[PDB]
Amino acid sequence: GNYALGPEGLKKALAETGSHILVMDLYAKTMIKQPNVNLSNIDLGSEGGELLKNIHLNQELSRINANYWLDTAKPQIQKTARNIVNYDEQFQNYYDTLVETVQKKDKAGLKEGINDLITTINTNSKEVTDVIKMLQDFKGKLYQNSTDFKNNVGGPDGKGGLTAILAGQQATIPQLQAEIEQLRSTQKKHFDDVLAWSIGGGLGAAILVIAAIGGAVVIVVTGGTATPAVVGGLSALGAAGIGLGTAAGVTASKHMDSYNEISNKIGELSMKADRANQAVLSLTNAKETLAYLYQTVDQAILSLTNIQKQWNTMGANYTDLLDNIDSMQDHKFSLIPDDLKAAKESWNDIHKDAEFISKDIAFKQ
């Protein structure tokens, strides 16, 4: 067209943002359900007793950070999506007036309408900057809690901390720690592969997958270790028209089943372990999740930075129209409705999916 008045790359950025919200919700809920590590009636010496006291303080702060995600940080990301919905409602409500001002050759009227939309675009861009600052602050708190916990569990380098005291008592502990770390990194890759398939299908498909997974998540606590699983995997998507039965859908289903397979295995390791080995499992599990949490907020910051870039690009595109209207000859002026109509359709197309991202994913209560 002559003027690009549509949502630009907002669809792709929303799909990524929705995927990060799901992952943060899972990790936060898992952290909240994991209890303080039980090493009662195990002689750890004074060194180990101090490390255990510090670990319990770290675990209490992990649960505070998880609740901050759920109650404070997430709603600010959801407002970013609500602002997309509200821009569509403003655009749809201005549309007939903007078309009328073209038909009446009313340049002042059209310019005032476009200026009002620019005002909203600029407000939306400024609001994302504030959300990114809030997330950067939160990332700093997640990184501090992660590194404090890692140091109390394993020292700076994995050669120390409470795990080395327990490994001094039981020679099988290092192999157990390594097994958990491997299972958790394999499992995260499987979940990332499911998310890759859901994003690859477009925002519409992404929202159906997010709803199906969120609605099916259960958190199981075994031997003091909390582990998520997705009941029935991707089963609920079989009639969703997103290609679950395609080769790529079958691969995504297999990854979800492998994710659940690893949750089962971690529970099995915990069931068979004594108290000390259960502590190695639970602390190692938590260590991995606390690092994944700050990594996922970093990803969320990147996706909101992209949303900010899209609002800024859109503000430039509308300002180009605004600046050109006064000198524009009648023929080009009469074509502006092509750009309005194209934008009407693209904005309406993003509304329901933005609305979804603006509201909690429905997990079990």
Author numbering: 42 to 406
Original authors' sentences:
The Hbl toxin is a three-component haemolytic complex produced by Bacillus cereus sensu lato strains and implicated as a cause of diarrhoea in B. cereus food poisoning. The toxin is composed of three components HblB, HblL1 and HblL2, all of which are essential for activity with no individual or pair wise activity. A crystal structure of the HblB component was published in 2008 and all components are predicted to share a similar fold, characteristic of the alpha pore-forming toxins (α‑PFTs), also related to the Nhe toxins of B. cereus (another 3-part toxin), the HlyE toxin from Escherichia coli and the App6 pesticidal protein from B. thuringiensis (known as Cry6 prior to a recent nomenclature revision). Although it has been reported that all components are able to bind to erythrocytes independently, more recent work strongly suggests that only the HblB component is able to bind and, thereby, to carry out a rate limiting priming step to allow lysis by the L components.
